[PDB]
Amino acid sequence: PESLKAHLQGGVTTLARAWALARADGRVLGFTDHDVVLRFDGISFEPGSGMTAKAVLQGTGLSVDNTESYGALSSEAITEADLLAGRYDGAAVTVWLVNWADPAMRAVIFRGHLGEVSRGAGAFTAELRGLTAALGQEQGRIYHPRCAAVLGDGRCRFDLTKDGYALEAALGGVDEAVVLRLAEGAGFEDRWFEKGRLVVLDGAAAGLIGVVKNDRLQADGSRLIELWQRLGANPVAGDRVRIEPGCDKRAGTCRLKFDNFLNFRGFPHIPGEDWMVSYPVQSGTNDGGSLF
Amino acid sequence: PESLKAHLQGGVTTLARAWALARADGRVLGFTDHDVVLRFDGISFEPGSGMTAKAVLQGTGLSVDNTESYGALSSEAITEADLLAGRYDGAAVTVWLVNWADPAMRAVIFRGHLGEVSRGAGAFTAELRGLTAALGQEQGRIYHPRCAAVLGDGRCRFDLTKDGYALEAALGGVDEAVVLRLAEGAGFEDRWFEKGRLVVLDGAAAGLIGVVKNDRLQADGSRLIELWQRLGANPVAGDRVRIEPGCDKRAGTCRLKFDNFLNFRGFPHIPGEDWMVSYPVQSGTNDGGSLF
Amino acid sequence: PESLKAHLQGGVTTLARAWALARADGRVLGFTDHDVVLRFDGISFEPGSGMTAKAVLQGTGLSVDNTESYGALSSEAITEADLLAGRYDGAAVTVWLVNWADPAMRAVIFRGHLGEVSRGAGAFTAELRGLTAALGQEQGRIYHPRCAAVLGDGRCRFDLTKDGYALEAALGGVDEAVVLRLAEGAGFEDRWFEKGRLVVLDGAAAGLIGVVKNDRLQADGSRLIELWQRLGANPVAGDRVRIEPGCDKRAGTCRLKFDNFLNFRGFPHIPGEDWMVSYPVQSGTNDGGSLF
Amino acid sequence: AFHEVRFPANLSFGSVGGPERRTEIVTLSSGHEERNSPWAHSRRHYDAGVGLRSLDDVERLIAFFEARGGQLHGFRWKDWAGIVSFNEPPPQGARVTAGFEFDVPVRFDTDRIAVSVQSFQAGDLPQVPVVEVR
Amino acid sequence: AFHEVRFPANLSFGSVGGPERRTEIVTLSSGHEERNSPWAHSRRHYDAGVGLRSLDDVERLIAFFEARGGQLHGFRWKDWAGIVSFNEPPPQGARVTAGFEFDVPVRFDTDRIAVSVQSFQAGDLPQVPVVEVR
Amino acid sequence: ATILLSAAGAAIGGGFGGTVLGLGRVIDQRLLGSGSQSVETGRVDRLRLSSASEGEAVGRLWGRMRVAGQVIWATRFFESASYSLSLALALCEGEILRVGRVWADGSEIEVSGLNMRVYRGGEDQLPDPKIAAVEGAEAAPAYRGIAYVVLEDLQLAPFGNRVPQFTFEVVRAAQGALAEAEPDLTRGLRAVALIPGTGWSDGENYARGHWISGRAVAQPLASVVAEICGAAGITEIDVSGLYGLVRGYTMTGDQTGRAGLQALMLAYGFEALERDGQLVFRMRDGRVAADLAAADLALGEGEAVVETVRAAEAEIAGRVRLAYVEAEGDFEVKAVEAVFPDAAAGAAAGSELSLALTRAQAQGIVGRWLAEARVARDTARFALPPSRGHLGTGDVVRLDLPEGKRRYRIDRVEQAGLIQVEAVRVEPGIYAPADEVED
Amino acid sequence: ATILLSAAGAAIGGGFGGTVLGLGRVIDQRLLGSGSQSVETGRVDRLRLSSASEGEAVGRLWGRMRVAGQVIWATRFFESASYSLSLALALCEGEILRVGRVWADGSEIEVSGLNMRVYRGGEDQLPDPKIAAVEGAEAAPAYRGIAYVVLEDLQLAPFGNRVPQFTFEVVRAAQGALAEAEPDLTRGLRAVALIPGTGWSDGENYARGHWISGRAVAQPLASVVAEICGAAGITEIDVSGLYGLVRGYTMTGDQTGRAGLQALMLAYGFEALERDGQLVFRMRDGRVAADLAAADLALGEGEAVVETVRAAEAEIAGRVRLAYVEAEGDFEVKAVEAVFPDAAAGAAAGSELSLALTRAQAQGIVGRWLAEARVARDTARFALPPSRGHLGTGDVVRLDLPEGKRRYRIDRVEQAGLIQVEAVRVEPGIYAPADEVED
Ligand code: SF4
Ligand code: SF4
Ligand code: SF4
Structure with a gap:
């Protein structure tokens, strides 16, 4: 009081x-x-x-x-x-x-x-x-060889709208709220976004986030996309979704698809336990190299 | 249903x-x-x-x-x-x-x-x-220097009836169901069966298994035998027991009393922790031998 | 019965x-x-x-x-x-x-x-x-670099009355039973007893033990002393306390203030972990000394 | 919620009911007390209605519970005891009336009713409690 | 807390109430036991009031519970049973009177009341337990 | 006389000791659901070392996985003048396939340099190695079950002069009575041949190529879970609904029996159902068996047709982790994680699985858990009548509602003539390949 | 049909699993009081070693404290002919100050002998070190958050030829949104200079001297506890009542968040109060806010105005112990103890704090606990009315009685319109400097 x-x-x-x-x-x-x-x-x-x-x-x-x-x-x-x-x-x-x-x-x-x-x-x-x-709660990173951050994160800033990366197109063919047909499939690579944010900003599921998988275009740019989980609200085959691109969180997929290899926040090399207790044998390759 | x-x-x-x-x-x-x-x-x-x-x-x-x-x-x-x-x-x-x-x-x-x-x-x-x-439940063997199996086991098959090993004789003098006199003591060594199966196949305790200890014959082949535990049903001084021989589960008692030293399923030598962290000193006995 | x-x-x-x-x-x-x-x-x-x-x-x-x-x-x-x-x-x-x-x-x-x-x-x-x-309950000593015993203990016998060590004087100015004025402050060093036994043997708190801190004499031998904790019974500004001297439980304070450095029951040197896994480098000081 | 009818006219002598409060209370154990009121209003909480007429009145009374009742409807209640104030203290009642003229919309406090037959044409039921949900 | 009125005059025969003592008690299983009380007074704890008059008296009585009542107000109570002492022992009562002349301010021990109709004009309510909060 | 506040004492022991008689874990419990209590499982062994004591237990493994072994019968150091031993390292039990790629303390030693004699550890009871004729034939041990590897005239020169910690890649075929019936590759092949040959190179299509080098070892998941219940003694075990490849699981001795099995219930997700006395182990899917409407539930205990619990947002496991084994290269502990994009702000929940699996598979598993653990937030607690009692304890209910029509897999069926259910929310699309690229 | 004795089973799981959802330890619990359940905290790391696996978590620290680091991107051994490497050891996250005084396995190596390139681990995203141009620019990792230290052409000759365990003194400034506002020394100084100079010597007045060498590193306790709740995500954190210097705390990754904070609640003793939604962290004192008489308590549940519990004499913690870090010299685990003179006969209760603090301070802390844990024997269990509800959950009550007038700090306020209190006895004189001499 x-x-x-x-x-x-x-x-x-x-x-x-x-x-x-x-x-x-x-x-x-x-x-x-x-x-x-x-x-x-x-x-x-x-x-x-x-x-x-x-x-x-x-x-x-x-x-x-x-x-x-x-x-x-x-x-x-x-x-x-x-x-x-x-x-x-x-x-x-x-x-x-x-x-x-x-x-x-x-x-x-x-x-x-x-x-x-x-x-x-x-x-x-x-x-x-x-x-x-x-x-x-536990918060930490474990030096794993992938990346560690999401796309919007401060540890990897991306400017996720910077080009034709996002797919802004309105939805058709919602079926069982896992399959989504999408009338405007065409405009991107096949299997472009495999781990992205399906933010749906209209209709029933307003501002609801799911994760994509199986970005496949079957005919004439259909782009049938699955999701991991149900949205929990049925989209009405007229809603507008936007899908940010998919990051595999790997150095090869980082630098090739995206330009932002600088902001990696990951641990690619990470030698191993058997390296640590190893004593150097004076046989075979003992010159400076990648160890990969 | x-x-x-x-x-x-x-x-x-x-x-x-x-x-x-x-x-x-x-x-x-x-x-x-x-x-x-x-x-x-x-x-x-x-x-x-x-x-x-x-x-x-x-x-x-x-x-x-x-x-x-x-x-x-x-x-x-x-x-x-x-x-x-x-x-x-x-x-x-x-x-x-x-x-x-x-x-x-x-x-x-x-x-x-x-x-x-x-x-x-x-x-x-x-x-x-x-x-x-x-x-x-925990199931495993721990590399201990004894044996690990029972006599009837697949890991040490024995043919437990193969000679005059089992003592088939009918019982007398049951007393307090731990001491058993046994009229037909004579026929075997003193202290022949020390870890055996006292399967009693007649009377009150029908098909009931106890374990023997103190196989001693006092006079004229009496063979007074103790048990670890009560049978739980009193034998009636007329029942028939059979007692399989006793295995000390040791390499010396294995090969001497029994022929089956091949099927040992045990770990006799098992050097030790102090051997493992030992570095080889160049003094005294350093020729190939038993380490025993 | x-x-x-x-x-x-x-x-x-x-x-x-x-x-x-x-x-x-x-x-x-x-x-x-x-x-x-x-x-x-x-x-x-x-x-x-x-x-x-x-x-x-x-x-x-x-x-x-x-x-x-x-x-x-x-x-x-x-x-x-x-x-x-x-x-x-x-x-x-x-x-x-x-x-x-x-x-x-x-x-x-x-x-x-x-x-x-x-x-x-x-x-x-x-x-x-x-x-x-x-x-x-847990009882043990942990090789710590202080002492481990109290003054009266068998592991460090002291004869705590052997000279003018104890302060026998009757009490005045009890205030909030943490501050104690003490009329007869004078007779000892400033900050002589810092970990002692304030046994109060008269009045309300009869035979009650507290521990001293902040032994300071402000003017003309006042000797204002705090305690860690309340006595729990208020002394009545006329009681008699005796205060045994204070032991810092350290080798320097042991041998200087007290004579009993022999009966130490403590572990002063205790080299450390980094000494243990250290291999001897053949550089700098490698002659026999204190390591302190 | 309805505005359907008052009730069957008959009510036996003993139709009890009066206002409620939660007014939780601590009773400070070594002196007086202090107590809070979150209502500013009162549930009128009428109980112990009894229908007593012929069996011709019963079938319009058992389906009174059923047809417009169900569980969750009004059936405005008549009190034998638009804002009414009570001025007999220097304080005030100032209690509102959503319905007109003492009509206090309620609901029955029952999972079931229990109508009895007392003679060839006598129909009785002992109680129908209400609490006047808003 | 008010100073509003005593009460309606009518009280039926059976208006019970007497002082209530904390009397925290130990009840040693050996035998005799000690006890103490932290009040140094006694809550008078009057119960079982009954209003019985015409229905003209009822509407000034049901809102007596409501208007100046609520739950948490005084309404000084009249006892049919400034400091009063009790001298019939060599001990003393010496119990104070905050209000004048046996007026004992109270509160009702009820979340709700229950007024009944017993005939065309009869108004009854069976109990209004109080406890005289200071 | 009255009773004390050991009324709280007799409420525990044995007031609650009777319960667990008849009955990182941060993510282990959600994946099994309400289910049952997840036993501590698979603290993965990194820096595999060999301890020569007498209190270490006999290990067991199924497939291509490194195991430390331990010393049994080492002779004295022999100076040639600069040392020599005669070790025997006992790896694991049961008849095995051959041991290849030995590497000691450090990187790698060539097995051609060694004089090792591998042994299958056959129940046929392999005779003495005759290198134990140092001891002599009369005391030569002749190990029946365990699969020991002797080492002959081992020069201790390249690795110091101390004994180095040896670690051995072992291939062990799944055994047991259900395994000898229905033979998979490891004896089912009965002569494959067809070595492609036709000779840095073209291994980009090895994960999709028809040839079976390397992956011929990996045992089907059906017989390994049959081997567990066979060793535990349950021969009534039913496992025809399982479809998985093991590829080198490893639990030690005295690993509770079930806690070794419970790591597989996190990886492949299967039911361990037990409808009848068969203990049916079926792979978990979303295939709906019930189709209840809301009108068709019974009257429960709490007098609610369907109590629906949604778990806390502060504990949803925003990011999940593993500790799998590399399974292609040098077998080392690795880790992948799956991070949900909206809520990455916390709740890391990881666990450690001691089996060996590849790189795209591990990111597939952790991608599956992070989806499932957020799906399995919703639990339902309803009662259904014994008019349809054929809802076995592991089935999944459609459960039509006025608002939703959300599926529910069920747990903790307690009936007594009124089947009362603690369900949990399960979707069908969780159990799919993630289809990710490889390393 | 009836129910079995899994009525005890359903009483536990999840009959009591709902509790800890919504909720050496020998001395940890008494210092927090009735309070809440003290989570396992700070098993102090002795023999700091660096493990090059993939499952170790990212450490975090605040101030001058040694941390092990671990290997990321080591090149192959290079023989000059007698070895050479190119390590990179990653210490901790966040922007740090510089790393000085590197010592490997063993005593000490001079950093001038090394070719190390330290990195702050800036969110500015420091580029590649160009020693990773062994790998090449196209695969060079460029670590954003973590603060790695590369090592260049490191001769493995003096320490064997194996890789030695390196340990690094690291200075890390406390960060977070509350830390950038209100700047302390580490950027607040904005140029001190005034180096005394004027040249074994006179360091007997260093603990009282005006110059700030060494202790300029140590972060105030206000921002470090603000960094914890910032990393956990609570930005509503209120910490103006804190007054302490940290001097090198260190908790690892996945240390629960709160269990890292709970070690500070034992050292500096502060409330973690949460009156309102601010979560006020105030330093604990004896400043009395209530002044209740005995006449002013409410009627409790047990119908006793004040239930007063005095704990057992057999468990009073007669002697208390720590496991602090040396913080001035070579950072090593040390221990001091405080022994009560009357009852030294038993009840040793020690705990381990992973922070670093000096020698007179550690004997000050253990001198404070041994006084407090014997003061906090008495607990009171009373109920006070909502007429004075402004007694926040961490305040302290004078509580006049007929016999005593003993203060009580309160815990576990459960009100529902009747504030019922589990207090605990707290004196004011406990929270003072002990004023002891130094080492
Ligand atoms: S690949 Fe690049 S953009 Fe994607 S998560 Fe990793 S660092 Fe961020
Ligand atoms: S001694 Fe021989 S028969 Fe007896 S248990 Fe051992 S192996 Fe089996
Ligand atoms: S300083 Fe001496 S007298 Fe004091 S406790 Fe230590 S050993 Fe005992």
Whole structure:
């Protein structure tokens, strides 16, 4: 609490809980216990869903906080066809504790990250992982002979729009949301993009990312492309996708297809264990060379 | 279920559970929920015992399945003097799910191995370990300087009846089922069989295996033999035992007492750690020899 | 039980539980279930406190036994200002099982060590750790370059009263029981005792041990001394403390301040890992010296 | 949610019901207390309705639960006890009425109902609790 | 906390209530045991009030729970049973009165109330338990 | 008298000791699903060294893979005047094919320089090598099962004068009763010949060429998993649905039996299903067997027709790693990783597989896990009636919903007359070749 | 049908697997308190060796500390006729300062004797070294992030002829978005000069002298803990309350993120508080914020105003130990211990911290733990009302009692509208300099 102590030290208090979650898409959602729709920021908290607010826990230790936050799913609300397709994953929340008589008397209990959401029986139950969720994970590179970065990354900047690299064409023939026909296949090499981002920016799957595989053009530039996984929302054979090119993350495929061999961030040579414990025999090749 | 789906898709169904366990001895036992004795194979399932059938579990993982299978022990049944002595250990079951109206409409839920049996209060409770019980155990040889196999094993075939090796004589003087007098002690060396199989093939302990120790003949070929453990069923001073000879599992005792030194399956020399990190000093014995 | 079996094999029995705990100070406390004050030794067991006696457990394994022993705290009793300050820590108990009709018919259930005491709601709950509490702990020295023993220890005997080393002076200016003014500061070096025993032998904190730090005399031999931790009982600005001198546990501070450099029990030189895998280069200093 | 009808006219003597609050409470153990209210409103929570007429009234009452009921519809409820305020304190009620004139839209608090036959034409059912969902 | 009114005058025969003491207790299994209380007062803890009048009294009673009530307000309570002392022992009561003349400010021990209709004009509610929060 | 807070003590031991009786791991658990508890598996051996003690266990392997071996019966150092030994290094058990390409401590020694006598370790019980006539015939050991390699008059001159750590490429054919029936190449070939000849060169079509040099060794996955259950003693093993090539797996002795098998369940992904007592090992696919509508589920315990759990975004394994063995060149520990392009910000989850496989295959496997572990976030927890009990424990359910029609493979079937299911989300397109280029 | 004793099985998995999802260690747990579960942390690396495999992770460090590095791109042995190589040893990531004082296997080699070319590993993407024109420009690797050190024409003559294990003193400045704002010495200095000069000597006042040789490297504790959360991705990190010097911490890759941070929570003792979404990292002090009387606690769950637990005497950690790094001389693992004079009879509890710090500081830290772990025996378990909810999860409560008035820092706040607290006893005088003499 932040200077509502004058309100709070009195036994007569009226603090009704309320929270907003910001999805990965730009829209937020509103939730409150107050039973009347209220807002203080431009969020318009709705008591139509959400809000059981069960027992936020704390700890000086790096372990996260948690709140299961039982609620309801509906057409205005999360609606669960949105949730199942792949949204609300890294959804960021702030829980508030507003005075409903005066919403300028509020604070934040925690800012969470909403890890595990269990929906069932016409309702949803969503564990609010704490601020320290990212700690507790392994991050590192292991000197492997491929590359290590994605295309947009700072360790390999590319300017991914710099030429006719991206395929901007609108989609037809979505079939089972893994096969995609694509009317405008023609314009690129066969098997040009094999590990790319199928960002779909229109229609049902709005701003949803999949990964391509099997970039094959069968006849007259069809370019039938598979994906690893379902998009989770069916594209409607009229959506617009853009596909960034595919990186095999290998030195040969780096420098040939792309110009950016300088920004490699990989470890091509990496001699081996048997080199390390080897003592130099004075036989055969012992002049300076590639060792490859 | 195997083509009882026509019976089963109707809500009017009548599938009564039933199972047979095959003991380590050749006899099987029958058990059913149907409350009337029924059979389809030559097993004659009895509803007099067994059969509470609590919650068979499953898993794609290598972990076993389980069913505690509460029941009753009686004179026709397991009777628990049979169970305590050492039978029903590796007892193999099949649980069935028969139609009592027509026992040709059946399947197997699982084929189990009945690991843990807890009997008490005039009843028994027997955990049915799943098909994958053997996985999850350590099997291996550790290069130790003895032998590694039993006498009948494929890695050391012996023809254990090939001469006067086995002692076939009928038993007298059973005392506390560890000491055994044996009327026909005479016929063999003193301390001939020290690690052998005391298979007792008659009477109470029928086909029960113990291990010998202290093969000593005190007077006129008595051959008082101890055992490591109780047989669990008292022999009646008239039973017939046969005792295979004792193997010390050592190269000297292998080749002297037995002819089969070829099929050794052991590791006699096995130099040692201190040999391995040793560098060769040019002093003393450095000519080719046994290193023993 | 020890020869009360004649009393005990009869169903008519009357064995009422009772126990005595001996504190770290010389006094003992008495406790009984009998509801009448009774004694057999000079302990005077009081039923005014203690004694719920819940479920002593046992084990052939090295793991301790346990008994939570719910009771009451009062002015005659533990009183919890005694307990919180640091007493009853290594308190040794014996639980007895006396006949209240004849207290010469008794035995010991176990002799415990009273590990964890949880007091609350006007009562206390004290887990009686078993006889084997000391097993299960790590004891050892790790070749570190300091010393390893305390001043009174057998591995470094000192005769801690042998000269004007100890400061026997009575206390004034106790403040917040960390700062201590001490009227008789003068008599010693500045910063003479920096790791010593502040044994306070009078008043409230009777026989209570703290550790000194910041031995500084500000004006006219004040000798303001801090401590690491609170004593837990407030001294009353009239108590008598004695402070043994401070040992830095280092070879230089050993031999200079104290004479006892012989009884060092420490490991000053201890070359290092990089010495061990080093091969001798034939350059620079390769003559016999300190390596320091 | 409907605006279909009030109810069958008959209600037995004993149709109980009054407003609710969550108002969770801590009861500070060594003195007074402090307690919070998140509602600013009240669920009227009417209970213990009883239909008692002939069996001609029963078939229009059992399908009252069924036809326009299901589970999730209004059926505006008549109180024998547009904004109404309560001025008998110097505080105020100021409680809204979404429906007109004490009509308090509700829903039945039952997975099932239980109509009984008491005589050749007597139809009884002991309780139909409601909570007035908005 | 208010100073609004006593209550409706009517209270049925059976309006029970008496002081409630924390009385934290140890119950030693030996025998006698000690105890202490942290109040130095006693919550009077009145229960089982009943309003019984016409339906004209009911609408000023149901919003008594609602309007100045909510959950968390005073409504000073009248006892049919400035410092009062009790001198019938050689000990003393010496219990304070924040309000004047036995008026004991309270709150109802209910999330909801339940008013019943027993006849054309009869209004009843079975219980309103209070505890006199300071 | 009352009980203490060892009510928590008796809740554990043996209150929970009865459970695991009747029952990096960061990515091992998600790939098996809810499934069962993934046992610690395959800390891959780098710097293969030979320890001459008595407590090391007998290794086992299937196919072309280097193994360290250990010393058994070394004679004393013999000075010619500058040393000589008579080693015998025991590699692995069972009848093997021949040992080629020996390399000691360091790079490589030519086997023509050695005087080694390889032995198959035949159950036929190969006689004494007669180099152990140093010991004499009366104490000459005659190893039956294990496949030892003696070394004769070995000059310790080029590698110091100490004994060097020898490492041996070994080819071992999969054995066992299911393996002798249905013979694959290693005896099924029964004379191939047709050596192409017709002589730096044209090996760019070796991965697609008809000739079978090198890859003739690799055993089918059907018999190696049959060898495991055969050695464990399960002869009731059913394995006709398996389609894979092993190419040099290696687990040591006392590797639990199943933990050696569990590394294969990560690579080839197969079910280990056990519908009936056969313990059917079928390869995992998306072939739907159920087709449930939402109207056709039973009433569960939690009184929800389908409880659907979506796992945390903070733990999705954004990048996955392996520790496979090189399997073409000098057998060395390598690593590839697959990185998801949107969320590369963290959650590295790697594991180590001790088998040997090529370069395009390893990036294929890690490309498969990173897709699957993000697909297998969704789990379903429903109950289906015993009217259709023929949903075996490893089948996959279509599960029509009003919103989605998402498939689900099932685990942890607990029925008692009401089949209650912990499913997991599985798509069909995960189980495909990645079609990547090679090294 | 009924259920078995896998009711104990479903009580564990996943009955308790849901917990640690949403959540020597002998002394690690007491210092964090009730707190949270102390993750395994900092098994200190002694005999730093360089392994040339492909499965070792990229290390990270902050300040002057030796790191092993590993081999990437070694050419073949070149015989001059008596050997020569062209190594490149990759130390750590990020832009670093220069690498000085190289010592191989054994004591010391002079860097003037070498032909090494150090590289910062700049995100600016340093070009090829041109010693990799052995490979040629078309396949020359050009490492962006990692800071490799090549070695040119290295004579393998003085250390055998094998490759020796090289170990490198590395100075790395703390980076990250919070570090570039608020610059400390390592770029904040912006030209110091003033070299004292005026020439065994007078170094007895070096620990108190104004000149900044050596200790100019050491990064403030504020930015290093900011670098951890920056690499983990938490940019909302709040760290203005931190006051410490790091002087060469080192955690490896895949060190969990937090377990690298948790070693700092033992050394400098700071809160990692998280009042709000800022995750405030404040240094722990005894500054009391609450001042509760006994009359002002709420009614708890167990119906006790204050449950006070005093831990067992048999487990009080009578003597505490460290495994710090020498940080002034040749960086080697060392150990100091603090022994309580009354009870020295047992309970040794030591832990290992992989950072580097001096000699009087290590005896200061272990002197602080042995005082704190005996102070933190007492824990309190009370509930306080939401009338004062501004007691954040890491604050400290005065807690007036009739008998004592003992302070309590709090942990594990679980409120739901009734703040219930597991406190722990904390005194103010624990957090002071010990003021000890040096080596
Ligand atoms: S190939 Fe080039 S662009 Fe592609 S990931 Fe590797 S470094 Fe980045
Ligand atoms: S001594 Fe011979 S027969 Fe006996 S176990 Fe050993 S190998 Fe087999
Ligand atoms: S300095 Fe001397 S007296 Fe002090 S602890 Fe060390 S050995 Fe004992």
